[PDB]
Amino acid sequence: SEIANVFDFPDLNRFLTRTLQVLLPDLAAKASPAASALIRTLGKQLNVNRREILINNFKYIFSHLVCSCSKDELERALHYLKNETEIELGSLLRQDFQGLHNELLLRIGEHYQQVFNGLSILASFASIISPELMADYLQPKLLGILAFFNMQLLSSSVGIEDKKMALNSLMSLMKLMGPKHVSSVRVKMMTTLRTGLRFKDDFPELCCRAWDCFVRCLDHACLGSLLSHVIVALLPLIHIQPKETAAIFHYLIIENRDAVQDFLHEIY
Numbered sequence: 330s331e332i333a334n335v336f337d338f339p340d341l342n343r344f345l346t347r348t349l350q351v352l353l354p355d356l357a358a359k360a361s362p363a364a365s366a367l368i369r370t371l372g373k374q375l376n377v378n379r380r381e382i383l384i385n386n387f388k389y390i391f392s393h394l395v396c397s398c399s400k401d402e403l404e405r406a407l408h409y410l411k412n413e414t415e416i417e418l419g420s421l422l423r424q425d426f427q428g429l430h431n432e433l434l435l436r437i438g439e440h441y442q443q444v445f446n447g448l449s450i451l452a453s454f455a456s457i458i459s460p461e462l463m464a465d466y467l468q469p470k471l472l473g474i475l476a477f478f479n480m481q482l483l484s485s486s487v488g489i490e491d492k493k494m495a496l497n498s499l500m501s502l503m504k505l506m507g508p509k510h511v512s513s514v515r516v517k518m519m520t521t522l523r524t525g526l527r528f529k530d531d532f533p534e535l536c537c538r539a540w541d542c543f544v545r546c547l548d549h550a551c552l553g554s555l556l557s558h559v560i561v562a563l564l565p566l567i568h569i570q571p572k573e574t575a576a577i578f579h580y581l582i583i584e585n586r587d588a589v590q591d592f593l594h595e596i597y
Contacts, residue, residue, distance in 0.1 A: 345375065353386040354393050360406035365413050380414045387418065388425045392432035395447035396440035419454065426451040430470040431477040437505075438498035460505075468510050471502065475517045482524050489528050493535060496525050500539050503546035512548050519543070519558050526562050533566055537573030540566075544580055553592040556581050560596050 330341060338344030349371060356364045365379070372379030387410065394403050407418035414421075422429065429451060433444040449457030452466050478495055481487040499521055503511060511518070522543055525536045540559060547555060559581075563574040582589050 342375070345371070349375075349382070350386070350389075353383065354390060356383070357390045357394060357406050357410065358398070360402075360409040365409075368413075383410055384414050384416060384421065387414075387421050388428050389432065391422065391429050391447065392436060395433065396436050396443045400446070422451065422454055426454060427470050427473060428477070430467065431474040434467065434471065434474045434502060435477070435495050435498055438494070438501040441501070464505060464507065464510075467502075467505065471506070471510070471514065472517075474502075475514065475521065478521060479524065490531070492525070492528065493532055496521065496532070496539055497535060500542045500546075503542050506546070508548045511546055515547055515555060518547070519555055522559075522562060526566070529565075530569060533569040534573075537566060537570060537577065541573070541577050541580060544577055545584075549585060550588070552581055552585050552588055553595050556589075556592055557596050 332348060333341050333344045336344060336347075338347065352371070356368050359367075368383055369379040372382050375382065390410075391407075394406065398406075411418040411421075430448055433440070433447050437444040445458070445463060448463060448466055452462075455466075457463050457466060478492075478499070481495070482492060499518075503518060506514065522536070522540060525532045525539065540563070544552065544555070544559065559577065563577060567574040581592075585592075
C-alpha cells in the first residue's frame, strides 16, 4: 500500500500484480522457506494460490535465472519452488520450453551463453553446445519468437526501449540464423524493421545498423523486394541520420550491384 501511495495506482491489487511480476524473480533467487512464506502471504492477499502464482511466472523465471544465476543455484531454486508448487519444475518446462527459448532469444544478445545453456537443457528434455546444433534447435522456435516480439510490440505495458534491446538481439539472431533460415524469415525481419520504424528518434540510431544487417544478413541472391521496402523506410530514416541510410543503400547498390540491376528499375 505504501509503494502504492508513492505509485498511485487505481486498484491496489493490479498495482500488487505490477509489483509481483518483479517480486517473483527475487523470490526465485531466495529459494528459501521464508521466501515461500512471503509468496504465500502475497497469494493469500492476492486470493490466488501462491503455488499457482509461482507457477505462472516460472517461465519468465527460468529465462531471467539462466541469464543471471549460478547453475547449481538454479537447480536448487527450481527444486525448492517445485516442491511448494506441487508441480515438477521440469514438468512445467515440458509445457513452455519453447516460450523459454523465445524469452532467452529475446535476451540472447546480452546473455548469449546463458541462452545456450538454457536452450541446451531444454533440447535434452525435448528428446546443443555446438553452435550449429544450437541453431538447428532455434530454427523451429524462432517463428514463435518473432511472434512473441510482435505480441510485445502490441502491448502498451511492455516498454519500447525493451523493444529496442530486443531489436539488437534480433540483429544477433539474424546473424545466428544463417542464409538458409534468413530466407524463410526475411518477411518477418522486414516486418520487425517496420515495427521499429514506428518508434523513432531513439530506435533510428540502432535500427540503422539493424537494417545494414537485415540487408547483408539476408541472402545475397535476391534483395529487390526488401530493398524497395528499405528505401521506403529509409527516406524517413535519413532525416534522423543521413549517413546510416546511405551506407545501407550502398551495400546493396555495389555489393549486390549485379542484382541491383533492374532493382534500380524497381524504385526510381
